[PDB]
Design a protein around this ligand. Structure first.
Ligand SMILES: [Cu+]
Ligand SMILES: [Zn+2]
Length: 154
């Protein structure tokens, strides 16, 4: 199977402009994520499956957090730590995306630990402002920081 997810900029006011799409498809080496996105800052961006089928903001510690309602990283093993697509932490950890000088992402990444699309239906896809060092050191959650764009996987 396959599905296409529309990605919207995550604002304090919720979903903003459409910034691109992700096609998720099944493949021998693990799920493929074909990403076409624009208006990113050049450089690496963290990319993860989050646990809830919502991209709404929320409040944490009295602060409005764009796309907070997507929850944390998809983590069916309840591992509670971030180890990237080759580690055995959050199963939602995908390979980082690479935006070029024009702010565009156009690539496929592969999650060898995810086999079936059904595993991540009714979840969400998140692209972050920061990158992803596949660790919780020196910063939590790979240093992804704020949520840049989000889409629901139906
Ligand atoms: Cu994330
Ligand atoms: Zn993670």
């Amino acid at each position: 199977e396959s599905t296409t997810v529309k990605m919207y900029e995550a604002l304090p006011t919720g979903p903003g402009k459409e910034v691109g799409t992700v096609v998720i498809s099944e493949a021998p080496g693990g799920l493929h994520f074909k990403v076409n996105m624009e208006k990113l800052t050049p450089g690496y961006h963290g990319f993860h499956v989050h646990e809830n089928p919502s991209c709404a903001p929320g409040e944490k510690d009295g602060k409005i957090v764009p796309a907070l309602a997507a929850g944390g990283h998809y983590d069916p093993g309840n591992t509670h730590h971030h180890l990237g697509p080759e580690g055995d932490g959050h199963m939602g950890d995908l390979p980082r995306l690479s935006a070029n000088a024009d702010g565009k992402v156009s690539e496929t990444v592969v999650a060898p630990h995810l086999k079936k699309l059904a595993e991540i239906k009714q979840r969400s896809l998140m692209v972050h402002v920061g990158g992803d060092n596949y660790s919780d050191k020196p910063e939590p959650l790979g240093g992804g920081g704020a949520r840049f764009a989000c889409g629901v996987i139906e």
